[PDB]
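Researcher: We're reviewing a set of sequences before deciding which ones to prioritize for further study. For each one, I'd like a predicted 3D structure that I can look through quickly. This is Thioredoxin H-type. If possible, include the structure in token form so it fits the rest of the review sheet.
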Amino acid sequence: GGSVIVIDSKAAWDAQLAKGKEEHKPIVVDFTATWSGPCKMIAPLFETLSNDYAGKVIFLKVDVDAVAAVAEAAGITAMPTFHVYKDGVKADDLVGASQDKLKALVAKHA
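Model: Here's the predicted structure for Thioredoxin H-type, in token form for your review sheet.
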């Protein structure tokens, strides 16, 4: 919900990366899995952050099992993994469900 945009395909991924270029907003992505306890724990915070930073940062969700080709291309091997994209390319990351480090990652780029 909120401002978290669910990515279902490479085409949708590419469209959102292009939108970030046009809007000059960083994109933060949660590469996540439904079966992962840490992922479930932090997904609500990812959503509230998406609302708090609406207008400054774009938030995407990629389920690594439903969009495996995108997650594989992005090198995801543990979940949650957060990436930041700027100008279409990877700029920063965080591996693991750390609420404090996720808040810090978003603030750094907003």
